Design a protein around this ligand. Structure first.
Ligand SMILES: *[C@@H]1O[C@H](CO)[C@@H](O[C@@H]2O[C@H](CO)[C@@H](O[C@@H]3O[C@H](CO[C@H]4O[C@H](CO)[C@@H](O)[C@H](O)[C@@H]4O[C@@H]4O[C@H](CO)[C@@H](O)[C@H](O)[C@H]4NC(C)=O)[C@@H](O)[C@H](O[C@H]4O[C@H](CO)[C@@H](O)[C@H](O)[C@@H]4O[C@@H]4O[C@H](CO)[C@@H](O)[C@H](O)[C@H]4NC(C)=O)[C@@H]3O)[C@H](O)[C@H]2NC(C)=O)[C@H](O)[C@H]1NC(C)=O
Ligand SMILES: *[C@@H]1O[C@H](CO)[C@@H](O[C@@H]2O[C@H](CO)[C@@H](O[C@@H]3O[C@H](CO[C@H]4O[C@H](CO)[C@@H](O)[C@H](O)[C@@H]4O[C@@H]4O[C@H](CO)[C@@H](O)[C@H](O)[C@H]4NC(C)=O)[C@@H](O)[C@H](O[C@H]4O[C@H](CO)[C@@H](O)[C@H](O)[C@@H]4O[C@@H]4O[C@H](CO)[C@@H](O)[C@H](O)[C@H]4NC(C)=O)[C@@H]3O)[C@H](O)[C@H]2NC(C)=O)[C@H](O)[C@H]1NC(C)=O
Ligand SMILES: *[C@@H]1O[C@H](CO)[C@@H](O[C@@H]2O[C@H](CO)[C@@H](O[C@@H]3O[C@H](CO[C@H]4O[C@H](CO)[C@@H](O)[C@H](O)[C@@H]4O[C@@H]4O[C@H](CO)[C@@H](O)[C@H](O)[C@H]4NC(C)=O)[C@@H](O)[C@H](O[C@H]4O[C@H](CO)[C@@H](O)[C@H](O)[C@@H]4O[C@@H]4O[C@H](CO)[C@@H](O)[C@H](O)[C@H]4NC(C)=O)[C@@H]3O)[C@H](O)[C@H]2NC(C)=O)[C@H](O)[C@H]1NC(C)=O
Ligand SMILES: [Ca+2]
Ligand SMILES: [Ca+2]
Ligand SMILES: [Ca+2]
Ligand SMILES: [Ca+2]
Ligand SMILES: [Ca+2]
Ligand SMILES: [Ca+2]
Lengths: 155, 155, 155
């Protein structure tokens, strides 16, 4: 019928405009504290928290902590850390089994970028190191979970 | 007709993807300076202003100052204030009638969370207190409108 | 057919809600570091960079540096600069031909708002001035490109 065809065409135009406007506002949103990789979005709050508090903040916000599963994802995190000039906590811990770092689902690492000599589980006055921080250069260091580091969430 | 049915199906897929992407970017946007409650969105600019300047900033931005009409809305504001560690101005004033706080539409309060002893209209050197600040604990204190407090806007 | 008509009506409702939600999240996004003018969106990162670094940051983010082509666009930039209280770099340089400022496409200025006495190409210890900064009052001053100024990107 002629009426619905005109309706479909109008909808087609509205959808196209929504898509154009959404791509623009996606880039506006991510500037400068976010990075998109595939269907994942990394964003920093610009503040520092302990691992447990960061875990609460990310969950509360409807997301989770960053789990870099590829060089592309890790490099995206590196950019955020570099911009804030503050090392960030990742999602992974070896809390269940020492030396065995896993995602918050128990799954073993599919990607790793340990700095030379890490993980060493030597946090000095803070004690054992069961969490992971990412440096501006993208490299990882195991770090005490009670330490304060940049919060990056994953949505 | 077969042509338009295929068009509707394609539109259905585009809309579904837009909805999925929009829910994700809603949470990305609100992290960490925004809170959604029903159809209302609270967001802080991270800066402090006098009541009048805050009123101008929120209006200019296409919104208004925060009018917590329920415990849920008030608690959302509490989280933002807690995160910034800065008490924020609300929208309500008793400027027309002393002791009678109203929304910027003249409507009386449907919800209130006054701290013990408030409102007292005693601002010391600033004079009368005709505006309202919200504490990290969610409680309210009547405050001089010329004082500087965190700006939270409502959209 | 009755089935597709109901589908079109449902799509109509979904699109309308998407549009309503998108206008709200557009204003939420732009508060307080963005300004919309026509189909262009200006946003500041809140940080300072040299012209070349700012050019890299904006490009990386999927946009470009601000090219105010009208009083409306320039005034929007003025508001962002005023809010951050930091003068920002614009996109234009006279690097190809001295005294002739052009957009990063070689096109001559369609709009200009030089402060009295500018451009003068006198940056003192920094040397020649081949870039442009915008003041809180909206006026322009030619500035050395190696100086650090507020980064505003255009999307
Ligand atoms: C740290 O602690 C971690 C937590 O315990 C632990 O993680 C575990 O790591 C192992 C080894 O990598 C891993 O096993 C692999 O799992 C792969 C994914 O599929 C899972 O899950 C799906 C369902 O989601 C199942 O359908 C799969 O069968 C498999 O089930 C797992 O099976 C094992 C027993 O076989 C159970 O113990 C797990 O509980 C169970 N997991 C789940 C979630 O159910 C899978 O693709 C891998 O397959 C390889 O091994 C199979 C035999 O196990 C072969 O049949 C298959 O062909 C694969 O062979 C590999 O092929 C390569 C070439 O292509 C060779 O180079 C490899 O050598 C060869 N590997 C082997 C072992 O033969 C594999 O099963 C567990 O999933 C994981 N556990 C959890 C809970 O995630 C770590 O080991 C600890 N150490 C470190 C350093 O991280
Ligand atoms: C501070 O200063 C404020 C500004 O002046 C002032 O705000 C006023 O507060 C009163 C009392 O709460 C409030 O009156 C209530 O209004 C309710 C909302 O409906 C309004 O508006 C709609 C249109 O939008 C009309 O259709 C309604 O009729 C009503 O109109 C109002 O009517 C009054 C006169 O009756 C006028 O003076 C107002 O100008 C006018 N407002 C507008 C915008 O037009 C309404 O639901 C409430 O209804 C109750 O009272 C009615 C009689 O007035 C009853 O018929 C009805 O059944 C309700 O009875 C209540 O029922 C409860 C149980 O269910 C009982 O427990 C209650 O005891 C009982 N209440 C009463 C009073 O009987 C009611 O009308 C005004 O709307 C509001 N004015 C403005 C401008 O917003 C405050 O009083 C000042 N003090 C404080 C402490 O805040
Ligand atoms: C700084 O350095 C800059 C870089 O070299 C330089 O920028 C150049 O500025 C000139 C003068 O303003 C400008 O010329 C104008 O271009 C207008 C836009 O159209 C362009 O491009 C389109 C395609 O995109 C073509 O279709 C047009 O023909 C025109 O092509 C240009 O043509 C000139 C030669 O004519 C070439 O040198 C350019 O390379 C070429 N550009 C491109 C991209 O291809 C155009 O609308 C303007 O038209 C006016 O002049 C025409 C004759 O050239 C007339 O036919 C037409 O009627 C217009 O007349 C004007 O009318 C007004 C009243 O309505 C009068 O008041 C004006 O006096 C009258 N102007 C003139 C000159 O007669 C015009 O062509 C160049 O486009 C631009 N170059 C580049 C690369 O961008 C600056 O001059 C330097 N100085 C300063 C201070 O900025
Ligand atoms: Ca450890
Ligand atoms: Ca270590
Ligand atoms: Ca008062
Ligand atoms: Ca008080
Ligand atoms: Ca120059
Ligand atoms: Ca100058």
């Amino acid at each position: 019928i002629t009426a619905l065809r005109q309706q479909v065409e109008t909808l087609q135009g509205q959808v196209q405009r929504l898509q154009k406007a959404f791509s623009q506002y996606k880039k506006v949103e991510l500037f400068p504290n976010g990075r998109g990789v595939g269907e994942k979005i990394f964003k920093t709050g610009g503040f520092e928290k302990t691992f447990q508090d960061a875990q609460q903040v990310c969950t509360q916000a409807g997301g989770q902590m960053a789990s870099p599963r590829s060089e592309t994802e890790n490099e995206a995190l590196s950019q955020l850390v570099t911009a804030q000039n503050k090392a960030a906590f990742l999602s992974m811990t070896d809390i269940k089994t020492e030396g065995n770092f896993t995602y918050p689902t128990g799954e073993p690492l599919v990607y790793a970028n340990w700095a030379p000599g890490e993980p060493n589980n030597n946090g000095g006055s803070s004690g054992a190191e069961n969490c992971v921080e990412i440096f501006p250069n993208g490299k990882w260091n195991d770090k005490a979970c009670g330490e304060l580091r940049l919060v990056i969430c994953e949505f």
